[PDB]
Design a binder for these strands. Structure first.
Ligand SMILES: C[S@@+](CC[C@H](N)C(=O)[O-])C[C@H]1O[C@@H](n2cnc3c(N)ncnc32)[C@H](O)[C@@H]1O
Lengths: 129, 33, 225, 260
DNA sequence: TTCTTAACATCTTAACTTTAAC
DNA sequence: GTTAAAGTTAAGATGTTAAGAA
C-alpha cells in the first residue's frame, strides 16, 4: 500500500491535537507564528478584536481599550504599530480622537495606497508624510 | 543607552518597546525642566 | 544638556523612522507568505507534559497511522524547567510506545537514576551516544567538572520490544557526535540525522522540545515551543 | 604546519607523556600473583587502599573470550581492602546497567565517567590514499607520533561490528566509596575527561602505552596522597586487579596478576 | 537533628585590546 | 605604518559540605 505520505496525515494531527494557533482551515502550518517569538503573534482573533474595538471607544488612549480587552499579550507599542496599517498612514497625530468605521477605514486605506503609488514613494504599503 | 537597545540579539518589537520607554522618560525629563 | 539630549531625541526619532520601516517591511513580507525555517510536516504541541493526557495522542496516532510511535526522544529538564526525578518516570511512556526506541539525554550527575528510569519503563539498556563539545578551531571544548574537566554529554538508548522488521536498520551511524556548542543547552543536529538513518519513514515523538529543531514528521511536545 | 591539522592538534599530549622505567629497588613495586581474585582470599595482602583498578576484558558475546558479571558478583571486596578508595573499572554498554548494580550492592556509587575516543590509523592511511610516505604500518603511526594530515576527524573514527549505533568509545567507570570520616585528599580538575587516542583496526580493545600513562597519571594526580613519597612504604594505597604486563609494575602500586 | 540546601570551594581556549619594536 | 608579545576576559548542562528550616 501507500507508505503513509505525511502531508495530509500531519494536517489531520494538527486538526486533532495541535494548538489552534498553529493550524488554519483544514491544514496549514501557519508559518507566520513560527518565525516570531513566543507571546507575540497577533492572532486573527486579536486582529478582529482591535478591528471591532477601534470603534465605540475613545481612540488615542489604549490603556482604556486594553482594560476591557484581554489585558494579556496586548502591549501598547504593538497596538500603535499595527493600527497604522488600518489607517494606512504612519502619522497618527492628525488622526487623534475621532472614530471611523471599518469600511471607511478600508476606503481611506485604498486612497492612501493610491496616493502613495501616484506620488511614487510608497515603501511596501506604508506611506510617509 | 543607544548601543544595548540596538543589540542584534534583541528582538525588534522589544527594541521598539524599550526604545519608546526611554523616549517617554526623556520627554518626561524635558517636561520636568 | 538640554540641547544635546534634544539632538538625541531627534536621533531616536530617526530611529523610530528606520525601525518602523524595517518592521513594516518584514511584516509585509510575512503577510505576503514568507516561510519560516520550520518544515511543513512538523506536528507541534504547546502544553505541559505533566498536564496533557497522552491517551488522546494514543488514539489519534492509532487512527491516523495505525501503528504506535517508533522513537520517543526526550532531553529532560533535569533537577540540579525544574521537574523532578519522579514526575519524569510517572508519565506514561510505556503506553506511548509498543515496539521502538527511547533516547534519554543525561548529564554525568543523572546517569544511574536515568538508567533506573529506563529499566523501570520496560526498556533494556542497549547503547549510549555521547556529544563531545568542540571549539571553532577544532579543539575539544573542556569546561567545569569536579574530578575531571567535563567535555561530554551522555544519552542512553532503551529498546522496548522487537526490532527485527522492515524498519530499524542495524549497524548505522556512530555513538560519538563531535560538534560545536551552539547554545546554552542545545544538542547538535547530527543526532536527528542519525535517527533518520536508524528509522526511515517513522512517526517520532519528542518530549521537552524547543523551537530550534521542529523537524519533519516529528511530534514536538513542549510548552515554550 | 601541524597546528592547522585537526588530527595533530587533537593529539599533542603524546610527546608530553613518557611512562617511567620499571622499578628495581623492590620497595616500589609489589606482586601478589595468584590464580583468580574470585578464587583467592583478598584484604590480607593489602589494606585500606585509595585507588582500585580492575583491568577487565569483558566477554560480551559468548564466543569472544573474557569474563562475565558473575565474577564481579562473587568479587571479594571488604571494608579492609578498600574503605575510602575510588574503584576504576572498564565498562561496555551491553552490561553497563549490570556493572552499575553489581557495584551498587557493594556500596560503590558512580560519581564520574572518563572516556577515550578511538581514531583509526587504517582510516587515516585509507583517507590519505583517497585524497592523494603513507606506506607504513598503523602501529608505526602509534609509535613515531607521525600523524597524516586531517582537518575532519569525525570521519576517522573506528568502524565496529555492532548491531546498533556503531561502537567508537572506551569507558572507564570510576565509583566512589563514601566513608565520611577518613575522607580523600584530591586535586580537582587537572585532567580532561576525553582524550582522542590513536588505535588499530580489527583490534579496538587495547589502549597503548601512552594512554595507559595518561590514565595512570590522572589516577595519581587525582589522588596525590597515594603517591610514593616517604610514607607509602608498606602503605601503598593503590593496586590493580587483573594486572597486565605493560605499565602495571609501578612505584606505589600492587600488581595483582592472574595465574592460569 | 538530620538530610537537604543553600552556599560556598579553580582550568582551558578563543577573542580582544594594548604596547614594543623595526 | 605593520607585526608580534603580553594582559585580559568571558564562557564552558561541577560538586562536597558547613548550616539550618521543619
Ligand atoms: C533543557 S530544554 C531541552 C531542549 C532541547 N535540548 C532542545 O534544545 O531541543 C527542556 C525544555 O523542556 C520544556 N519544559 C521544561 N519544563 C517543563 C515542564 N515542567 N513540562 C513540560 N515541558 C517542560 C521547556 O521548553 C524547556 O526548554
Amino acid at each position: 500500500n501507500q507508505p503513509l505520505d505525511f502531508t495530509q496525515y500531519a494536517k489531520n494531527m494538527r486538526k486533532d491535537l495541535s494548538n489552534q494557533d498553529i493550524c488554519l482551515e483544514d491544514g496549514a502550518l501557519n508559518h507566520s507564528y513560527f518565525l516570531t517569538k513566543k507571546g507575540q503573534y497577533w492572532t486573527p482573533l486579536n486582529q478582529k478584536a482591535l478591528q471591532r474595538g477601534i470603534e465605540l471607544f475613545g481612540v488615542g488612549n489604549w490603556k482604556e481599550i486594553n482594560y476591557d480587552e484581554f489585558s494579556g499579550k496586548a502591549n501598547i507599542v504593538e497596538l500603535e504599530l499595527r493600527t497604522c496599517m488600518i489607517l494606512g498612514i504612519n502619522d497618527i497625530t492628525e488622526y487623534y480622537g475621532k472614530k471611523i468605521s471599518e469600511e471607511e477605514q478600508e476606503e481611506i486605506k485604498k486612497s492612501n495606497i493610491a496616493k502613495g503609488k501616484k506620488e511614487n514613494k510608497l515603501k511596501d504599503n506604508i506611506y510617509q508624510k | 543607552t543607544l548601543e544595548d537597545i540596538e543589540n542584534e540579539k534583541f528582538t525588534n518589537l522589544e527594541i521598539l518597546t524599550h526604545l519608546y520607554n526611554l523616549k517617554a522618560e526623556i520627554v518626561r525629563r524635558l517636561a520636568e525642566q | 544638556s538640554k540641547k544635546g539630549l534634544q539632538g538625541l531625541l531627534q536621533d531616536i526619532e530617526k530611529r523610530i523612522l528606520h525601525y518602523k520601516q524595517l518592521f513594516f517591511k518584514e511584516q509585509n513580507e510575512i503577510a505576503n507568505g514568507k516561510r519560516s525555517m520550520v518544515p511543513d510536516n512538523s506536528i507541534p504541541i504547546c502544553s505541559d507534559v505533566t498536564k496533557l493526557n497522552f491517551q488522546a495522542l494514543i488514539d489519534a496516532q492509532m487512527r491516523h497511522a495505525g501503528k504506535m510511535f517508533d522513537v520517543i526522544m526526550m532531553d529532560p529538564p533535569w533537577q540540579l524547567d525544574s521537574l523532578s526525578d519522579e514526575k519524569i518516570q510517572n508519565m506514561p511512556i510505556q503506553s506511548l510506545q509498543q515496539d521502538g526506541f527511547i533516547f534519554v539525554w543525561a548529564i554525568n550527575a543523572k546517569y544511574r537514576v536515568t538508567i533506573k528510569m529506563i529499566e523501570n519503563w520496560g526498556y533494556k539498556l542497549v547503547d549510549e551516544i555521547t556529544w563531545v563539545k568542540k571549539t571553532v578551531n577544532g579543539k575539544i571544548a573542556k569546561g567545569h567538572g569536579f574530578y575531571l574537566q567535563h567535555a561530554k554529554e551522555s544519552c542512553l538508548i532503551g529498546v522496548k520490544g522487537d526490532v527485527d522488521n522492515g524498519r530499524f536498520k542495524k549497524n548505522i551511524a556512530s555513538d560519538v557526535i563531535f560538534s560545536e556548542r551552539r547554545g546554552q543547552s542545545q544538542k547538535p543536529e547530527e543526532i536527528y540525522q542519525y535517527i533518520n538513518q536508524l528509522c526511515p519513514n517513522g512517526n517520532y515523538l519528542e518530549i521537552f522540545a524547543r523551537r530550534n529543531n521542529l523537524h519533519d514528521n516529528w511530534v514536538s511536545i513542549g510548552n515554550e515551543l | 604546519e601541524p597546528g592547522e591539522d585537526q588530527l595533530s592538534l587533537l593529539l599533542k599530549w603524546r610527546s608530553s607523556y613518557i611512562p617511567p622505567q620499571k622499578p628495581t629497588n623492590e620497595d616500589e613495586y609489589k606482586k601478589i600473583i595468584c590464580k583468580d581474585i574470585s578464587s583467592e582470599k583478598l584484604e590480607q595482602h593489602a589494606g585500606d587502599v585509595s585507588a582500585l583498578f580492575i583491568n577487565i576484558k569483558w566477554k560480551l558475546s559468548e564466543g569472544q573470550s573474557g569474563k562475565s558479571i558473575e565474577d564481579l558478583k562473587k568479587l571479594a571486596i571488604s571494608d579492609k581492602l578498600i574503605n575510602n578508595g575510588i574503584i576504576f573499572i572498564w565498562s561496555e554498554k551491553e552490561i553497563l546497567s549490570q556493572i552499575v548494580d553489581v557495584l551498587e550492592a557493594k556500596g560503590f556509587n558512580y560519581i564520574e565517567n572518563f572516556m577515550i575516543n578511538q581514531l583509526s590509523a587504517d582510516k587515516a592511511l585509507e583517507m590519505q590514499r583517497k585524497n592523494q610516505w603513507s606506506d607504513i604500518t598503523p602501529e608505526q603511526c602509534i609509535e613515531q607520533e607521525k600523524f597524516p594530515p586531517n582537518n575532519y576527524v569525525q570521519d576517522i573514527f573506528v568502524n565496529s561490528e555492532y548491531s546498533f549505533f556503531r561502537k567508537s568509545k572506551k569507558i572507564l567507570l570510576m565509583l566512589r566509596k563514601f566513608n565520611k570520616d577518613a575522607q580523600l585528599e584530591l586535586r580537582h580538575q587537572r585532567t580532561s575527561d576525553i582524550f582522542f587516542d590513536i588505535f588499530e583496526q580489527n583490534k579496538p580493545n587495547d589502549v597503548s602505552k601512552k594512554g595507559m600513562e595518561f590514565v595512570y597519571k590522572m589516577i595519581e594526580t587525582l589522588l596525590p596522597k597515594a603517591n610514593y613519597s616517604e610514607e607509602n612504604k608498606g602503605a601503598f594505597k593503590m593496586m590493580e586487579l587483573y594486572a597486565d604486563d605493560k605499565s602495571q609494575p609501578r612505584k606505589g602500586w600492587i600488581s595483582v596478576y592472574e595465574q592460569e
